[model samples]
Target: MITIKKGLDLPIAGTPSQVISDGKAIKKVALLGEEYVGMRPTMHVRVGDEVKKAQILFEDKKNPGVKFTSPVSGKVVEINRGAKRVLQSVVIEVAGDDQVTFDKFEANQLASLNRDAIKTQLVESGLWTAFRTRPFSKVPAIDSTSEAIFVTAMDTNPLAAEPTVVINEQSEAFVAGLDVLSALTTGKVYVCKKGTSLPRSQQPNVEEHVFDGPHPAGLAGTHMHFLYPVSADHVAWSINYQDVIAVGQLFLTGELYTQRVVSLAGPVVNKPRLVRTVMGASLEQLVDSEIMPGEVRIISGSVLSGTKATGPHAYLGRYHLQVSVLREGRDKELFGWAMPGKNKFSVTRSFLGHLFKGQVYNMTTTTNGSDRSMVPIGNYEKVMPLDMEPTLLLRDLCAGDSDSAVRLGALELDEEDLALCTFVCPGKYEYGQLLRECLDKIEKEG
Candidate 1:
């Protein structure tokens, strides 16, 4: 149980913490992304649908409908419908035996496991959805010839999980996973490695360029665009190192382990463990027994884009690996951005003298400032590691300009790449939302 302070910079070399997935499992049968937090569900299943794992439960309302799959084999139980039934999620009931059944394939030898075999495995299993391309964060078409593969192996966020520390024991296996990933695509399999006093031999795809910047470099899109620029027609596939491990388990065990190394962390937590856990796990089971009693916002994944869940062990609603806890501490102030306080966390240079020195900044859910109008700030460049202009690209996105957005490498940016820009922006723009909207537009236009 490692306690990381100072932006929660996870200890990068040796495995920081064990991946934890222990709990009375609550499988996410359906995840319907509503327009707002209050939107209701567009239900798919009646009461008992004998759905298989990764089976499509529902899809996005807009164009290029992205299907949301069931995380386990079970029957639909509770349909928690929100605003206008527009926002809805389902709870599936698994049988007595909690074994995950995967689509079986018999490839006697590793050499026999060629690109098509690999693609079949990924597609058959739920792992293929992990490869999201830019110009909108949509799952790459299964038939499309993969131009390249990108793997990000670092944490650039203030307190994001460090892959080097969490998966230290699985270094060789990670490299093996890289080999398997490369087998799937003749295109360059770009693996982004991070330096933290770790041995060079452990670097998966040693030729993978090392990312040595702020938090978002952990994102594959940021590093990929920084090195390999993308054209409008060019579609690239990128996956997180953690998902790569999940895919590796498919080749080794012929089953979807649903296993992932997760960080259970919060200022209120007594013990933050790198516990062993699975996808679609509940939080109550993994959280340390001793947590400060208060109204804390339980978030699955990272705070940046993680959904806020109120149920016990219900932190992660999908294939998320990291769980974070933040206290609901909010208080309004008159012209708060103008007043220099040592507590606020600003990624932009709005605060005087903040660029020179660093402070332990606290963030709250309250949108600090209104989006009066879009101003050209150098803030995007400070955090965005991609080669193209993020500010200009995002600007074009707001106006529903699909061509310019794709022309400027919008396909190269993911929610993870622009997390820092959102975290630091003084104007309080939702970088993830902007990226998602842009993606939605591109998907429609395409």
Candidate 2:
């Protein structure tokens, strides 16, 4: 078992109640371009074209092997574009259910399959997007192999989906998923999770590890640090637990299963609960009649690491597991910092409300401070559980020195790795995005 000592679990209200309600009939599902980093998409279908499930909507212009298919069978409603006429998202109106089914495999057949065979099939199914590479946090490049594959069956994001509950419901399929990943690499398939161990299955190269801690403990970076660290020239692959279930189900049933187990939660939500829906399902529709009426900020994932939701166009991110809602703190607080903030919850203990132990605060979208230069308070190490120096690495990143950042252990982290550092920052600097910018520069130079 891995015990992570340093990390912060924010005391925010609205943890999803264990009970799950039926998912609403989603009218539209969006396939956003921003979800796939480094993907140069070239459209195959135009707007208003009838598309079938698993049919190619767009493929990587550089690599034809990487195909982006539709999750729902419907007509392409809108192909939203941003500045420079860049592809933003493709909206599909859900009409019926049909998919491009492949040859089903038994347990024995799966064991006999070669790596190329499995990889080719996954590429064709468009589920190849599920396997993301380390260092870049993007989908694994066309035909690129990894030294190891890590499957993290946990979510550390606030109000994120429960791991055990999601995994146990499809335990057999998850095992089947493990078996599939085992043949993909020479190294082991690391199954990092919380709670009880999984049931024994056909995986021979499986290395399941247990983790216990707060937010970021369940993140892939923490798992990789403890299990297998990515070397300078070496690359590794990782996937979410829910995606594993989808992969296993793909091989078992020979059908494309893009359904998502999403946790709709937050402070403004009237009834926070889990919903079973398709990938990129509309958030506005999912929370229809479930949230209190007000001018609130809807986030696609956790407040710290998630992006802002755009109402009707806002859909679940490709890798997100939760939808958080918060009150828009627009009104100015006159001398709020000097006054005793009894209701405010501060990560730095700057507010008096932190004195009240175990109190869940109704967090808002306010940073409560303006952006300023980084201050060396030496508190980032207390909340960051990784082996590297969080503050220095971020410092190097802010200076646009990828070489120095790499020396200071920048490759070992993603945006989520520095989320706590961003939260605990007195200057209100977003180190997470800063770290991402540094990683992007390194990936480009390499």
Candidate 3:
């Protein structure tokens, strides 16, 4: 395992995007939103449908078949239908005791399982379609011959998970999860971590590659697509280490386990550390008095692809292992970008006088610079840290060239991973939505 000097631990200022047991408050719900204008809900149910934990309730319209499942088992109390009575929202209400129960499945070790069994278990567990294949990364067909499965652990993005955080308790489970994923492919099951020694025992058939790179490097699909491409005859599946556990837990229990560990971090946090918690865990309990006092943005996942989805859809995606809360200081600066301010800190030397005695710039969610033409300064590569050509893929996206984008490695990238690109874009383009558009466009055509 290759390693780098660890980044500073920011204050846990924003909301801890999770729900936990707190002796009482038997019921909790989330109202997830992307918060963009004209955005519609993907919800499918309304008022009073009995929902099992992990049961899917909404699916992307463009990718009609792939869905987002419910994190809690309860009654569909409300659907908060958005824009045009279109299925734009959902509000699941927990009923009876708040205890979560499951319908279990038994795995007969390695000898008895086959491709069909694995596929069945994944879909039946509401996890089969979670691993999207490239060429727009839609939910891959269950019967598609997958060439490999990749799992990445290290996150180099700002306020990313600690290198040791995910590896600590998840070591053995992570390895076992890798083994199980390996079962799905005749090809390799590559486990990309920062170093050679993690907290778990290594497994056979698992290619544990040690990597050290920027943000995109930690995104396994970004690395793998550079090393290998999925053929049309073969599909490749990649999941975060967090998602792998969700898949493994389901296969083991024969029930869907939607539990996740969320990290509440950024300049707005009081104290930031990885917490052991379940999906849709309440941020109210974890963050009520824990974060730094300030105007903040509570992001439900990583900055690149994470949403400020701090409400009901909190547990919608099992793979979003952490929540980030960034400061929302948009206080006006008098000619801020032009001032020869030596103390202001920034990665790009866009700030004048920041070259000398550059202070740690406390970032606010406010758009600092005025909107301008899309300046290609290779900013994506500066932050992305992936192996595949992010620049070309993004270009292909803008050009709407789905075919070349896939060949240029769109499969390995997810909207979440490119979210930072959206944030820092001078064009002020929503990169996540753009990636989603490209993916959805291709998936529909496919």
**Model 3 CA deviation exceeding 4 Å by range:** 1-26, 30-46, 54-69, 95-108, 170-172, 199-203, 231-234, 282-286, 310-317, 350-359, 375-396, 399-412, 423-427
**Winner on TM-score (2 vs 3):** 2
In order, the Cα lDDT scores of the candidates are 0.59, 0.82, 0.59
So what's the TM-score on candidate 1?
0.77
- For residues 240-341, what per-residue lDDT tens digits would candidate 3 score against the true structure? 777776666666665665556556666667666566665655555546676677666676666656656544444333356666767776578777657765
Residue 16 shift from truth in candidate 2, angstroms = 0.9
Decreasing TM-score order of the candidates: 2, 3, 1
* CA RMSD, predictions in order: 5.9, 1.5, 5.0
Error of 1 at 42 (Å): 11
Steric clashes per prediction = 34, 0, 24
Tens-digit lDDT string for candidate 1 (1-446):
11112121322212224444344344443443532221222446666777666666664443233345666677776666555653445666654334445544432343235777777677666576677665455566666666567776666543456677645766545655666776676666776777554323232333456666445545556565666655566667677778876666667666665656677666655566666655665565555463568767777777765767664235355446667776776777788667875555554455653554544333445677777666766766665544567678877777777678767766666666666667656566776776677766765566
The true-versus-predicted C-alpha distance at residue 350 of model 3, in Å, is: 4.8
Worst 10 residues of 3 by lDDT: 4-13
